Design a protein around this ligand. Structure first.
Ligand SMILES: O=C(O)CNC(=O)C(=O)O
Ligand SMILES: [Mg+2]
Ligand code: NI
Ligand SMILES: [Zn+2]
Length: 331
């Protein structure tokens, strides 16, 4: 069995190996990368996403989100308070202000310590989930707006043509902006490219151990767990590495830097934080191996998780017994 300890693997594809996206995902899986739940892909030195980032300041962040925490430093929830629209240039200036800027630090490990000590005492503002792309249309390799769609994959594997579309999303971050513990919708893959700026630290639980994280979460968030049998779909709960280690939960960590891709694998729980002003692009995708995870994915039906238009068909075709209840949650 490849990668039996479920370590995060780092790949360095050549320019020739960077041509065929599906083939390279399959290769990484042949080497056991999925067992970790997360992999890093460093593009060949010949590649670039676009020519420059000098002209992005006028992108609008229509609904910046202030991430307000409740709880204790290692075990907390966050809610998202909507703020007035601002441009990427305005948001960058805000991120660099004395109130929001990254503190002085020695190295990534010192910053990670400071994050977990201090996160709850601040409310950073995240420009998340903005439909759009920063890849140049002429970038032919690993262009996250030109991937095979999940609807086409389902049709290729299962024969059923379905409605829906699959487009990327931009994330503008600042120090302490946080992504809560989650798997993807329908336990899909994700791919995330860090276009510019400061790093992003990731934590991940191997897919084979995901239910251990879920059981801990039910213990640590007992009201939320009574409210919903899949409350991590709400994407609000944070648990620190220290708390995970105290509770014996298997996990790994890695820091992504600008110019690097990360891939999350089906049912790989992940969480993390941004080091300072940055911009990432991410999208969900599927492979043949995903189908069985899609069929078994948990679902929130309490009403809180509220998701895209395109998830309807995935539930309807892969999970027909759950469909009616899930859709009640959506309406
Ligand atoms: O970058 C973020 O805030 C969150 N990203 C992801 O969860 C991802 O790419 O799957
Ligand atoms: Mg612009
Ligand atoms: Ni994710
Ligand atoms: Zn729910």
């Amino acid at each position: 069995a490849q990668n039996p300890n479920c370590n995060i693997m780092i790949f360095h594809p050549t320019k020739e190996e960077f041509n065929d996206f599906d083939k390279y995902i399959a290769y990484m899986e042949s080497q056991g990368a999925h067992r970790a739940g997360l992999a890093k892909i460093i593009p060949p030195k010949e590649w670039k996403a676009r020519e420059t980032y000098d002209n992005i300041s006028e992108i609008l962040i229509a609904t910046p989100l202030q991430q307000v925490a409740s709880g204790r430093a290692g075990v907390f929830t966050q809610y998202h308070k909507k703020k007035k629209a601002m441009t990427v240039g305005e948001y960058r200036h805000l991120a660099n202000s004395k109130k929001y800027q990254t503190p002085p630090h020695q190295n990534f490990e010192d910053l990670e310590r400071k994050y977990w000590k201090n996160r709850i005492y601040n409310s950073p503002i995240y420009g998340a989930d903005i439909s759009g792309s920063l890849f140049d249309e002429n970038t032919k390799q690993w262009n996250l707006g030109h991937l095979g769609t999940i609807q086409d994959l389902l049709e290729k594997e299962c024969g059923v043509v379905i409605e829906g579309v699959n487009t990327p999303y931009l994330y503008f971050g600042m120090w302490k902006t946080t992504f809560a513990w989650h798997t993807e919708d329908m336990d899909l893959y994700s791919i995330n490219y860090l276009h510019l700026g400061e790093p992003k630290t990731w934590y991940v639980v191997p897919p084979e151990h995901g239910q251990r994280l879920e059981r801990l979460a039910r213990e640590l968030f007992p009201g939320s767990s009574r409210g919903c049998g899949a409350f991590l779909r709400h994407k609000v709960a944070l648990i620190s590495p220290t708390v995970l280690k105290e509770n014996g939960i298997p996990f790994n960590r890695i820091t992504q830097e600008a110019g690097e891709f990360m891939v999350t694998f089906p049912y790989g729980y992940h969480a993390g934080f941004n080091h300072g002003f940055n911009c990432a692009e991410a999208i969900n995708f599927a492979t043949p191996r995903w189908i069985d995870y899609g069929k078994m994915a948990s679902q929130c039906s309490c009403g809180e998780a509220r998701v895209t238009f395109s998830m309807d068909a995935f539930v309807r075709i892969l999970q027909p017994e759950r469909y009616d209840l899930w859709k009640r949650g959506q309406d």
